[PDB]
């Protein structure tokens, strides 16, 4: 029986603060350089706001504590789970958007205004251009890590069809981690497998598999534990129209139009492609740096962070400019072009401040089985399902280890390997001992109490 | 109290420290107000650079003024405790002191609305990349 | 090494924030409006009326 | 490629704001002084704190 | 078929006289695609000249 | 006029303005103030001779 988190819990009146300090992360906008001698030795990373900025907290066990009151807390059955009731993001940059572009872009011509005939043969016609992207501001919170689809290839088919060669396809549903790339309008897809030139796409994203989040299946998720709340604001329009340069694999049927002759005898290709433009942004369009109060969640988990962990994400585009350097090598007297050298960087700062409420959860013989149905982990994180371990009778009983009748002993148990998150590179925060209760000494609890009717 | 040494660390509430409180609980608010007349003030200069003497070095001729500079203003107030009153039957100076508190806010402006423009005369643009 | 050119936009009489009174109900800090030292450092930034 | 380490100030008069060109020390960072317009290659510009 | 679910229930209704008819009081549109736009053109497109300048 | 001792010239007023540039051009006259030389590197060839600003 599916039941929300409002039907078996007791709402206390104790509230505790969290707040994060200065995040340090500055890197190169385009790519991460490595050592030429070693691939695991970077000096600067690739940073951008167009990466999925997916972060995770570390919060301590509230049952690890000592307080003079335990009249509220029967330690036999009752337990303590954390829940978030307040939040704010802190950001620390002036507004500025950067632009990018492949230096060998697949622009054959422009197809907005005119085409004097005809297209010409040739195997090499690429050039540098540059353009902005889709703008946004967004976030999401849930105590399971957020998901996301992205399109890719498929298995081809059986060889019953002997018609042509056009490749298969599939979307791929995945929990997205930190660093992965958002789609910007070319579909949420792979650029290495689905494309083949890597010259339709700018270099930073030409070697990527961009995704789009699957809020839809997270909506049709039963409990709603990967989603508590989410935001979005986006706008777009075209800048110009250009065309690809390759063999169009598909022909066009003929009676749909009339063909011309002579100079107009050649039918030009129709492999057009647009190029984007975000609109003007204002400070009235700001999403961040405000409180968004929990009063009504979308699903069954009402703010309850299971596992004392949370999975926060954000994508911003208005602070996506890149500051660069321009230094010389030689001191001169006049202007030469060979003298000066550039280095470009990109800056990021995240600040995260929260308000909570602990809640005592009494454990009967019935709710313990209900959570046993959801997931047995938090149950044994409360250590409630135990079995008495046999096997005491051991007599490996010597005084010495360096002998002549060896048994080839083996050790180093790797036993705590239980985390699934080891394959997934996040950026994290351990905020565990940064806590107090004096919300008057915090620039958000003061705002909370006047909001809370206190 | 178990069969193990069991040496995980423990969490504590922090020690009771003397804290800060707001400025609202010990002030005795008054109902007397005074105006801040700041009649018109002038500023001029060349927005390209401050121009100077070639003979001296720290003799400017006009300064450099522009809109994108930080326009901070430092006001100076009189002390309320020195003041001449009609009445002090409300106020014992032996145990009480006087402090200001602003209530009123306004930015008076004096220019038609419109922005300047500039750019480097030896700006190093390599090429266009729009089209 | 591409670089854009910033532009800005239209400015209005409704985008104006000055020449109008303000009456703050509550200051942001524990100091709820008390100045000290008989001085204050007020700052405004406007490029909007900055024609030369 | 030098890494940079931030530090603050106190905003005085005659300091220019960042106008979309990055709060940094243009004297100590870009020696050519002709990649930006005239008024901004010499001094530095600031973005004020709103969090500390 | 609304008339084919209910077990024979006398006091609820009479299938001899009463009928069961659907209505609708709820609707929600689901859309999976992100925001995006595309173009369509013509390579033998009739245009004489431009006239805006 | 808002600080006139009687205020007999402003009972009421309104104002409503919008403005933005279209293009960027420069003037051709021999300007007054030469540029401080420290702000740039000296020119070369056709860049050694100076244009207007």
From Swiss-Prot, chain A:
Keyword line: Capsid protein, Disulfide bond, Host nucleus, Host-virus interaction, Late protein, T=7 icosahedral capsid protein, Viral attachment to host cell, Viral penetration into host cytoplasm, Virion, Virus endocytosis by host, Virus entry into host cell
Major place of residence: virion
InterPro entries xref list: Capsid_L1_Papillomavir, Capsid_L1_sf_Papillomavir, dsDNA_vir_gr_I_capsid
Cellular compartments annotated: Virion; Host nucleus
GO biological process entries: endocytosis involved in viral entry into host cell; virion attachment to host cell
Gene Ontology CC entries for this record: host cell nucleus; T=7 icosahedral viral capsid
Pfam family, one: Late_protein_L1
Gene Ontology terms, MF aspect: structural molecule activity
Known function: Forms an icosahedral capsid with a T=7 symmetry and a 50 nm diameter. The capsid is composed of 72 pentamers linked to each other by disulfide bonds and associated with L2 proteins. Binds to heparan sulfate proteoglycans on cell surface of basal layer keratinocytes to provide initial virion attachment. This binding mediates a conformational change in the virus capsid that facilitates efficient infection. The virion enters the host cell via endocytosis. During virus trafficking, L1 protein dissociates from the viral DNA and the genomic DNA is released to the host nucleus.
Cited HAMAP family: PPV_L1
Known partners and oligomeric status: Self-assembles into homopentamers. The capsid has an icosahedral symmetry and consists of 72 capsomers, with each capsomer being a pentamer of L1. Interacts with the minor capsid protein L2; this interaction is necessary for viral genome encapsidation. Interacts with protein E2; this interaction enhances E2-dependent replication and transcription activation.
Similarity comment: Belongs to the papillomaviridae L1 protein family.
Name of the molecule in the record: Major capsid protein L1
Organism whose genome encodes this protein: Human papillomavirus 58
Name of encoding gene: L1
UniProtKB/Swiss-Prot annotation, chain C:
Localization (cell): Virion; Host nucleus
Chain's role: Forms an icosahedral capsid with a T=7 symmetry and a 50 nm diameter. The capsid is composed of 72 pentamers linked to each other by disulfide bonds and associated with L2 proteins. Binds to heparan sulfate proteoglycans on cell surface of basal layer keratinocytes to provide initial virion attachment. This binding mediates a conformational change in the virus capsid that facilitates efficient infection. The virion enters the host cell via endocytosis. During virus trafficking, L1 protein dissociates from the viral DNA and the genomic DNA is released to the host nucleus.
Similarity comment text for this entry: Belongs to the papillomaviridae L1 protein family.
Subunit-structure text: Self-assembles into homopentamers. The capsid has an icosahedral symmetry and consists of 72 capsomers, with each capsomer being a pentamer of L1. Interacts with the minor capsid protein L2; this interaction is necessary for viral genome encapsidation. Interacts with protein E2; this interaction enhances E2-dependent replication and transcription activation.
Official protein name in the record: Major capsid protein L1
Species in which this protein is naturally found: Human papillomavirus 58
Gene that encodes it: L1
Part of the intact protein present: 316 to 367 of 524
Curated annotation (Swiss-Prot), chain E:
Organism expressing this protein natively: Human papillomavirus 58
Subunit note: Self-assembles into homopentamers. The capsid has an icosahedral symmetry and consists of 72 capsomers, with each capsomer being a pentamer of L1. Interacts with the minor capsid protein L2; this interaction is necessary for viral genome encapsidation. Interacts with protein E2; this interaction enhances E2-dependent replication and transcription activation.
UniProt family annotation: Belongs to the papillomaviridae L1 protein family.
Superkingdom in the source lineage: Viruses
Functional note: Forms an icosahedral capsid with a T=7 symmetry and a 50 nm diameter. The capsid is composed of 72 pentamers linked to each other by disulfide bonds and associated with L2 proteins. Binds to heparan sulfate proteoglycans on cell surface of basal layer keratinocytes to provide initial virion attachment. This binding mediates a conformational change in the virus capsid that facilitates efficient infection. The virion enters the host cell via endocytosis. During virus trafficking, L1 protein dissociates from the viral DNA and the genomic DNA is released to the host nucleus.
Subcellular location: Virion; Host nucleus
UniProt feature coiled coil, ranges: none
The protein, known as: Major capsid protein L1
């Amino acid at each position: 029986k599916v039941v929300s988190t409002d039907e078996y819990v007791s709402r206390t009146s104790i509230y505790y603060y969290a707040g994060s300090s200065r995040l340090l992360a500055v890197g190169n906008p385009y790519f991460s350089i490595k050592s030429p001698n070693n691939n695991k030795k970077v000096l600067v990373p690739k940073v951008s706001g167009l990466q999925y900025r997916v972060f995770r907290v570390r919060l301590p066990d509230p049952n690890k504590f000592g307080f003079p009151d335990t009249s509220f807390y029967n330690p036999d059955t009752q337990r303590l789970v954390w829940a978030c009731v307040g939040l704010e993001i802190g950001r620390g940059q002036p507004l500025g958007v950067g632009v990018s572009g492949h230096p060998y872009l697949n622009k054959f011509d422009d197809t907005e205004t005119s085409n004097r005939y005809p297209a010409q043969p040739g195997s090499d016609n690429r050039e540098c251009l540059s353009m902005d992207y889709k703008q946004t501001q967004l976030c999401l919170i849930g105590c399971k890590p957020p998901t996301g689809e992205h399109w890719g290839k498929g298995v081809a088919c059986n060889n019953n069809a002997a018609a042509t060669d056009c490749p298969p396809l599939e979307l791929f549903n995945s929990i997205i981690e930190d660093g992965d790339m958002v789609d910007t309008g070319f579909g949420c897809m792979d650029f290495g497998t689905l494309q083949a030139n890597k010259s339709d796409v700018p270099i930073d994203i030409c070697n990527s598999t961009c995704k789009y989040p699957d809020y839809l299946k997270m909506a049709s998720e039963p409990y709603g534990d990967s989603l508590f709340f989410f935001l979005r604001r986006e706008q777009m329009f075209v800048r110009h129209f250009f065309n690809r340069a390759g063999k169009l694999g598909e022909a066009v049927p003929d009676d749909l139009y009339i063909k011309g002759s002579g100079n107009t005898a050649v039918i030009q290709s129709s492999a057009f492609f647009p190029t984007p433009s975000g609109s003007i942004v204002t400070s009235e369009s700001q999403l961040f740096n405000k409180p968004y109060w929990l009063q009504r969640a979308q699903g069954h988990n009402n703010g309850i962070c299971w596992g004392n962990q949370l999975f926060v994400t954000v994508v911003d585009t208005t602070r996506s400019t890149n500051m660069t350097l321009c230094t010389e090598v030689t001191k001169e007297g006049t202007y030469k072009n060979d003298n000066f050298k550039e280095y470009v960087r990109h800056v990021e700062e995240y600040d995260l401040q929260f308000v909570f409420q602990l809640c005592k959860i009494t454990l009967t013989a019935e709710i313990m089985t209900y959570i046993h149905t959801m997931d047995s982990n938090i149950l044994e994180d409360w250590q409630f399902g135990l079995t008495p371990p046999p096997s005491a009778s051991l007599q490996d009983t010597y005084r010495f280890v360096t002998s002549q009748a060896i048994t080839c002993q083996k050790t180093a148990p790797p036993k705590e390997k239980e985390d699934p998150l080891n394959k997934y590179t996040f950026w994290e925060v351990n905020l565990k001992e940064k806590f107090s209760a004096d919300l008057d000494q915090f620039p958000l609890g003061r705002k909370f109490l006047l909001q809370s009717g206190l | 109290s178990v069969w193990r040494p069991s040496e995980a660390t423990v969490y504590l509430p922090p020690v009771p420290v003397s804290k800060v409180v707001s400025t609202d609980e010990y002030v005795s608010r008054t109902s007397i107000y005074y105006y801040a007349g700041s009649s018109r003030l002038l500023a001029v200069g060349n927005p390209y650079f401050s121009i100077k003497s070639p003979n001296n070095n720290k003799k400017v001729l006009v300064p450099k003024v522009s809109g994108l500079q930080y326009r901070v203003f430092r006001v100076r107030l009189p002390d309320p405790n020195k003041f001449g009153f009609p009445d002090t039957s409300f106020y014992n100076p032996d145990t009480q002191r006087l402090v200001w508190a602003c209530v009123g806010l306004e930015i008076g402006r004096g220019q038609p609305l419109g922005v300047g423009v500039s750019g480097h005369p030896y700006l190093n643009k390599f090429d266009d990349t729009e089209t």
